Amino acid sequence: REIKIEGDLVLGGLFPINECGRINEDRGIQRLEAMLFAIDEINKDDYLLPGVKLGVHILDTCSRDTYALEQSLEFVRASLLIAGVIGGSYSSVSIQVANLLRLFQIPQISYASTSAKLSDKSRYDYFARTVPPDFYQAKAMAEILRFFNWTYVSTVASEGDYGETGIEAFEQEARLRNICIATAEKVGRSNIRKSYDSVIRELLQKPNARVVVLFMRSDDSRELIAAASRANASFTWVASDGWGAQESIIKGSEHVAYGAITLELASQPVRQFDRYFQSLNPYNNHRNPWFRDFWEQKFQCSLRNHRRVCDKHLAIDSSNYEQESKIMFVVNAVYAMAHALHKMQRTLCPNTTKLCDAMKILDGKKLYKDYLLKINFTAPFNPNKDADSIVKFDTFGDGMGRYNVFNFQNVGGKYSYLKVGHWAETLSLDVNSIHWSRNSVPTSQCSDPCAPNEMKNMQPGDVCCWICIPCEPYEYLADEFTCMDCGSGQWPTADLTGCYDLPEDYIRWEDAWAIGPVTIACLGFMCTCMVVTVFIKHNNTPLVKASGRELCYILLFGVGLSYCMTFFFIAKPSPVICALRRLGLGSSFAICYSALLTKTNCIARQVFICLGLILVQIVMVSVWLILEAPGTRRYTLAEKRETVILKCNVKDSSMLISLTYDVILVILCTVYAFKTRKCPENFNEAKFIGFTMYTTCIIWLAFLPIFYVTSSDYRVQTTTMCISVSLSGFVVLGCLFAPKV
Amino acid sequence: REIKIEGDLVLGGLFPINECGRINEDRGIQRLEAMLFAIDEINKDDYLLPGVKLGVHILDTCSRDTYALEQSLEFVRASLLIAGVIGGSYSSVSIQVANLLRLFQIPQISYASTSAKLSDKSRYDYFARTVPPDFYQAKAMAEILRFFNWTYVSTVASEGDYGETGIEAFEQEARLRNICIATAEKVGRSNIRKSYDSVIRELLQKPNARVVVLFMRSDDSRELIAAASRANASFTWVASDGWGAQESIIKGSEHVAYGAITLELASQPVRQFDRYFQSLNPYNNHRNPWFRDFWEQKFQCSLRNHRRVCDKHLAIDSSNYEQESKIMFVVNAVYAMAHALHKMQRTLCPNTTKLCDAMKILDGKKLYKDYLLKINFTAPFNPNKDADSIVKFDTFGDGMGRYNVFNFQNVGGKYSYLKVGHWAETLSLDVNSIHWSRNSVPTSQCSDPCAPNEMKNMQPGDVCCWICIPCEPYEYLADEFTCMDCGSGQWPTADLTGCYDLPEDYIRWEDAWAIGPVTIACLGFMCTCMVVTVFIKHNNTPLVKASGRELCYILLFGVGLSYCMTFFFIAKPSPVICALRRLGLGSSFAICYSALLTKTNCIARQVFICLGLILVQIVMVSVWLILEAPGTRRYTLAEKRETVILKCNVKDSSMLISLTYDVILVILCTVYAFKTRKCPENFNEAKFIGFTMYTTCIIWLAFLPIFYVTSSDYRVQTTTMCISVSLSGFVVLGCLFAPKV
Ligand SMILES: COc1cccc(C(=O)N[C@H]2C[C@@](N)(C(=O)O)[C@@H]3[C@@H](C(=O)O)[C@@H]32)c1
Ligand SMILES: COc1cccc(C(=O)N[C@H]2C[C@@](N)(C(=O)O)[C@@H]3[C@@H](C(=O)O)[C@@H]32)c1
Ligand SMILES: *[C@@H]1O[C@H](CO)[C@@H](O)[C@H](O)[C@H]1NC(C)=O
Ligand SMILES: *[C@@H]1O[C@H](CO)[C@@H](O)[C@H](O)[C@H]1NC(C)=O
């Protein structure tokens, strides 16, 4: 089981064919028929090793680490001849052969070993890939979980030298663009969490992690899809090139990965392969001893007594297979050895064409410094040469990171893969053909964004998580993380940034006071109207002649003003109104004192009536000073969180100070009118004035101490002030008209 | 630089000597002079390979991975002779030589390679240690962070195949005994966090992680102590056997690790070593070419023109060195090869003694199945044979986990290590000789335990962290995580589990009422006393004869009872007292109705006085029914969070219902006594009774509507009820005595 065609030079090469059940049919013998294709297409091509036939010596690796070492001794046991192997297509296969070809100085060219450990050039100093490392693959998994703003993800990586050193470079590149990984764990096949149902349940315990980064190998992604359909669930499988663009890892679970996003490595494929690999039947196939049963296992044929025996019209056309992505890399990484062993011949022995004596030892260290910086044109089957087709190794012997972004679009019945994107500067994937799980762009964040009514961003200690919590309704949410207050008087709008002020109320609308006391004040116009018969119609009455005929024009005209000052208590507050209420209340109780205590010396006496007529302005001039000097415009009281009630610019004691200027003259009114409690003059002094000395001004000391207790203060001061003069309007001044007529 | 002494058989062995600056002097040539000691002590010992001389072929490893492979080819390049190597003392040295000795079937016996990857017997099937794995070392780091209850730790492990597979078995054994690791990171020498100041600052950003699990190698623990003293800080270094019991990793930082707890592997050392290694001078030392400059580098001597040249009286006694712990393991793991190559000779060729023809090929696979189950007595220098000294491999080729627990006690000036503990069942370390950092048993938990006044355990989503938060003061903290309420009436004690009830108040102490109204009631005894002159002294008065002489014994005796029912309003509430208040208040106002409305028909009238004398019990019999049928015991009102005020078992309307039974007879009292407002009989009816018809019962309708408004209800009903009868006690019944005398 090893090909041996002779040649003046020998190229090695060890390929994963077995897996020893299957022949692997996609990344296996579809690559061994490509490297052997290029060797068949070198010896015919002149000006590239002319006259020096290249022969190969190929062995399988059985897709296993410690079996590759037993097959790697077939090269070097003649050295204790080979001028370079073509590496191993897997990762753990090609690490622990570079730890044995290093000792004999044999160069190794891998073509798929995307691992980060193989750039430490102090240990593997004979290892140049033609595939970019996995640091440029975590960089395409941070810029693809930020173009969709997924933040709360859950990474899964297989154990070994591929996952654990390709996910330790993702956790140090997802904690740099604020991506919060929930659950990271191993899945590998040596007793960590080897039950695949024990790890698909852990990804189901989190309900808010629908984006799972599958950085696993090609073995633990056909046993994590065959264990994510039994224990039935679904996510958005974002996966590395372990999954890749393989249509044989998904052969029996075509509905659970129906929105998967995988990224292969970008390759414009070769177009002379499908005229060669398609024309290889088991009848005409000599060299490789694994191709004689490849068509047996692929087409399920036979050659013991199994199913349908091979008919000769069974070939491999484009209805069977699609050419693998990493077939450009196989024919590229074998010409790089063919450009090294040609430029060496142009240096050591340029006069001769065949193998000289100076190139018969094959100095390995000199072969690694004539080759590591060797750029070239291309694999010559791919056109657009200058448009990114230059094979070129870096200082570490790598390629350039060029990553297509595939998608598992299940649209045409046949569940096929489909390209959407790019890399190397550009995240250029177009969201118009990407199908998804449940046909929607999914979200995975730690906490949901909530309503902007009272919530706020409260991130306790980290960046990826927060919590929305209600705050006060009088505040505004300005900085979107802590709401702030605007103060009393103003109320925030629906935007929760600015606050709008409020007026007081419609005091004059009804309030059970815009119709009640003004109807009592509607009869207040009838107090002076009913007393107008004493005024002008019957001014020559003998009882009025013995009364204060000049005094009743002060005693009853202001009684109508006491029935008129309540009108200003219902209008809008203003310096023309609420300061006039300070001028009105002093004028209203300028009659209850000047017609009770003064009329004891006038109506129950004109030699001193000039001082009594000047007694109304005895404090009213000083009351004019307190109605002019302090602030007499407006105010606005603010109670608990909803009050804009606009009282005038005084206090309760300021009205009490004006109340003290007149009621003290009414306090000693009945004390100065207690002597005439039995003896009248015209049956009116002891019969009427003593009643208004007691009963009238007691109401002036009843509701007035209650004026500083109430809150709305609607009719406690408007009605009762106008109602208190109706006693002294009728029982002493309208009472005289009762026996008149 | 390789020892070669001949023999009929050959034992290998590769030791870490260089590091190529130092000769490492503790784990290096103090081991190579021990394996070569046992080979010098085998050929003299009969009955253990008799007549077959054992020769060694020893090479250095330079303490490096990929340099051991260039020296491992010196054994096997004659096979493309050696009958077994004695392994590599390091971890990464002895993994990637078992991946090359496996191919030629050569057994390898390590003696310090404590790693968990080397028990996967599908790959390294020619590798039997004599040191227990690292799964039994994480099991001694979970049971040592639970005996001190440290929970919030921060693990640090070096990169490679020792740390990352010895700390991935600690994180899966610290999340099993509730130990919450804060910061886990790599420190290894390939561009992860290779600045050691960048990782000692990350352990300083957490202020609550003073316990750091140092699972690093012997290289990143002399550059993490030489970078934890420059950027000066201190912790409690709990460290694996990378640190171990080495007194050369701490040579210049003897104060920063002064409370360190390290665990080596338990070994009762050999006692024939210090008679052999102490007697090896550079004059008499032939074989090993590294010992000729070992004493040059150890004693800082010379042999270009450096310091003090070697005098011949310079030897190595017990004042220089202490024998390493893993020297029992070197002489043990080389006799296991000597018991394998002896029991094979007793099987294949027992008739002859020397090497026969059947043992001249040295079948390697048969050498690994005659040996892997081979128990033996001991290395024969260690006594107490049956007391745990049996060399024995398990099914995976291991030892038994026996771990001493050292301590860096800096007590004697010379900062020496000191043993405290044990393992293999028992955490038996005794906390009486353990010095610490700052002489205290440290703590590292996520959140501190708080005061039990109002706090509670609030663990949001995890187990390792919580938060203490204050709750209500009327609740008790029962379950130590959520405080619970006990309800009104009872108040929790200092234990915050049980609640104690409260009485109401001392109502009769002062309350501005235990001296005020009772002094007014002290004169209440003087109302009947001043009226006693009308009672017995002057009962034959003509004004009293025209008055109700039989009626005043009902009108004034109950007036003293109205001055006596206020006494029950100050005593303790009870069915004898507060239900008597219901019987008293009806009896108190059985006089204000029967001497105002009834005395209008008696004192201002005996043909109908028998119905008036029966009018006191006209509703009092039904008032006795409501004083007997409902609940008449007690009650207890509970206001907001502090109130146990015990009113009697009625409502305010229940007293109002008793008030409605008598005051309605007093409501129509003045209406029935409004006719005699001008005409008296003995100048007492229209002059006194009409005053008590108006002024007395108006006070009965003044304070009684205020009795259901007050909260404390101290003197609003006790004083004013007794004060209201003083009007009808004096102005109508004491007023008649005023013109009498
Ligand atoms: C089955 O045993 C193992 C062990 C380790 C890895 C893998 C594995 O899945 N390798 C995958 C991913 C790959 N990009 C890489 O080199 O890791 C290349 C691509 C290829 O060559 O076709 C494979 C499999
Ligand atoms: C300097 O380069 C390296 C690389 C890897 C590990 C180490 C290392 O520190 N090994 C330490 C710890 C050990 N118990 C083990 O076997 O890992 C044995 C004990 C000994 O044999 O004396 C050493 C050093
Ligand atoms: C997150 O990314 C999505 C992807 O288009 C975008 O629509 C959205 O606006 C982004 N959110 C923020 C806050 O930038
Ligand atoms: C935690 O361990 C220490 C170590 O002795 C012990 O004293 C303490 O009581 C333990 N705490 C609990 C809650 O068991």
Q: B199-220: b or e for each residue (b if 16 or more CB lie within 10 Å)?
A: bbeebeeeeebbbbbbbbbbbb
Ligand 4 mean position to B440 CA, how many Å? 15
Element containing residue B659 per DSSP (H, E): helix B652-667
DSSP line for A462-475: -SS--------TTE
* Secondary structure tally for chain A: helices H, strands E: 26, 16
Residue A705 per-residue DSSP state? G
Solved how? cryo-EM
DSSP A279: G
Strands B490-492 and B499-501: antiparallel
Residues, chain B: 741
Ligand 1 atom showing the smallest separation from residue A217 Cα: 9
The one-letter amino acid at B83: A
**One-character DSSP codes across A22-77:** ---TTSSHHHHHHHHHHHHTTSSSTTSSTT--EEEEEEE-TT-HHHHHHHHHHHHT
- Matching fold, domains A1-132+267-275+326-400 and A134-264+405-446: yes
Residue B267's SS3 state is coil
d(CA B299, CA B343): 44
Distance separating the N- and C-terminal Cα atoms of chain A? 148
Task: Residue A464: name the closest of A439, A445, A477 by CA.
Answer: A445
> Which residues make Cβ contacts (< 8 Å) with residue B1, sequence separation at least 6?
B59, B60, B289, B290
B433 alpha-carbon distance from chain centroid: 25
What is the C-alpha to C-alpha distance for residues B42 and B623, in angstroms, rounded to an integer? 121
DSSP conformational letter for A118: G
Element (H, E) at A611: helix A609-613
The set of protein residues with a Cβ atom below 6 angstroms from ligand 2 is B 27, 63, 89-92, 112-114, 160, 162, 217-219, 241-242, 326
Contact A66/B102, CB-based, under 8 Å?
Answer: yes
Answer yes or no: are the C-beta atoms of A390 and A339 closer than 8 Å.
no
d(CA B575, CA B632): 6
- The CATH-assigned architecture of domain A450-500 is Ribbon (2.10)
Q: Resolution in angstroms, to 1 decimal, for this deposition? A: 3.7
Ligand nearest to the CA of B243: 2
Is A112 annotated to bind ligand? yes
Question: For ligand 1, is residue A31 a contact (CB within 6 Å)?
Answer: no
Count residue pairs from A and B with Cβ separation < 8 A.
33
Asked if A370 contacts A340 with a C-beta cutoff of 8 angstroms, the reply is: yes
Instruction: Give the C-alpha separation, A97 to A93, whole Å.
Output: 7
What gap in Å lies between CA A548 and CA A530, rounded to an integer? 18
Task: Give the residue from A591, A298, A238 showing the smallest Cα distance to A434.
Answer: A238
SS3 state at A98: coil
Taking domain B134-264+405-446, whether its CATH number is 3.40.50.2300 is answered by yes
Residue nearest (by alpha carbon) to ligand 2 atom 7: B217
Q: Give the ranges where B411-549 is alpha helix by DSSP (H).
A: 516-522, 524-530, 532, 542-545
Q: Which helix (H) or strand (E) holds B463?
A: none
Integer Cα distance of A559 and A220 in angstroms: 104
Rounded (10°) angle between helices B578-588 and B652-667? 10
Instruction: Please work out, in degrees rounded to the nearest 5, the angle formed at the alpha carbon of residue A393 by the alpha carbons of A423 and A349.
Output: 155
Pick from A79, A78, A29, A23: nearest CA to A58 = A29
Contact status, residue A104 vs residue A118, Cβ threshold 8 Å: no
Residue A166 token pair:
């390709």
A685 contacts A630 by C-beta, under 8 angstroms: no
Distance between CA A588 and CA B406 in Å, rounded?
Answer: 101
Contact B103, A74 (CB under 8 A): no
**CB-based burial label for B311 (10 Å; 0-12, 13-18, 19+):** exposed
Query: In angstroms, rounded to a whole number, what is the distance separating the alpha carbons of residues A492 and B339?
Result: 91
* β-pair type (B185-186, B54-60): unpaired
Helical (H) or strand (E) element with A305 = none
Are the CB atoms for A696 and A666 separated by under 8 Å? Answer: no
Give the DSSP H/E element, type plus range, for residue B339. Answer: helix B335-343
Supply the CATH classification number for the domain B1-132+267-279+325-400: 3.40.50.2300
Alpha carbon distance A331, B201 (integer Å): 50
Asked whether the beta carbons of B266 and B404 are under 8 A apart, the reply is yes
| Distances, alpha carbon B426 to alpha carbons A309, B114, B333, B433, in Å | 69, 21, 26, 18
C-alpha–C-alpha distance, residues A636 and A144, integer Å: 58
Identify from B70, B95, B96, B99 which residue to disrupt to test chain A contact, counting A C-beta atoms within 10 A and taking the largest count.
B99
Best to test chain B binding among A64, A80, A167 (most B CBs inside 10 Å):
A80
Q: Which amino acid is residue A612, in one-letter code?
A: G
CB distance A295 to A310 below 8 Å: yes
Question: Was B651 annotated as part of a binding site?
Answer: no
Token readout for B45 is 């010992």
CB A562 within 8 A of CB A721: yes
Which residues does A145 contact at the CB level (< 8 Å), separation at least 6?
A: A151, A153, A174, A179, A211, A213, A238
Q: State which amino acid sits at residue B316.
A: I
Q: Is A114 annotated as a binding residue?
A: yes
Domain map of chain A by residue range?
A: 1-132+267-275+326-400, 134-264+405-446, 450-500, 516-630+650-730
Q: Give the CA radius of gyration of chain A.
A: 53
The single-letter DSSP state of residue A626 is H
Strand partners, A492: A499
Provide the sign of the torsion angle of the four alpha carbons A216, A222, A227, A232, taken in this order: positive
Atom of ligand 2 minimally distant from the CA of B92: 5
A56 beta partners: A11
Distance, in Å, from the CA atom of A43 to the CA atom of A49, rounded to the nearest integer, reads 8
What is the separation, in whole angstroms, between the first and last Cα of chain B? 148
Burial environment of residue A134 by CB neighbours within 10 A (0 to 12, 13 to 18, 19 or more): buried
Per DSSP, the residues of A319-375 read TT----GGGHHHHHTTHHHHHHHHHTHHHH--S-SS--STTSS--HHHHTTTTTT--
Q: Which fold has domain A1-132+267-275+326-400?
A: Rossmann fold (3.40.50)
**At a CB cut-off of 8 Å and minimum separation 6, what does A612 contact?**
A551, A594, A598, A601, A602
Q: At what angle do helices B718-730 and B578-588 cross, to 10 degrees?
A: 30
The residues facing A476 across adjacent strands are: A484
The response to whether B114 counts as a known ligand-binding position is: yes
**Cβ-based contacts of B80 with chain A (< 8 Å):** 77, 80
Rounded to the nearest 10°, the torsion over CA B29, B32, B34, B35 is 170
Q: After which residues is chain B broken (C to N over 2.5 A)?
A: 19, 80, 303, 605
Return phi, psi of residue A710, to 5°. -75, 160
Integer Cα distance of A534 and A540 in angstroms: 9
> Reduced to 3 states, what is the DSSP secondary structure of residue B518?
helix
Residue B473 vs residues B454, B458, B487: alpha-carbon distances, Å: 7, 18, 11
Residues linked to residue B490 through DSSP beta bridges, in sequence order? B501
Element (H, E) at B347: helix B345-348
Residue B59 is inside which H or E element, if any? strand B54-60
Closest Cα to residue B405, out of B268, B265, B222, B213?
Answer: B265
Residue A663: φ, ψ to 5°: -75, -20
Whether A349 and A358 have beta carbons less than 8 Å apart is answered as yes
Chain B residue closest in CA terms to A117: B190
- Residue B355, C-beta contacts closer than 8 angstroms, at least 6 positions apart: B8, B9, B52
After which residues does chain A have a break in its backbone, defined as C to next N over 2.5 Å? 19, 80, 303, 605
In B, what residues contact A, Cβ < 8 A?
65-66, 69-70, 73, 77, 80, 96, 99-100, 102-103, 120, 123, 164, 168, 186, 190
CA B244–ligand 2 middle distance (angstroms)? 10
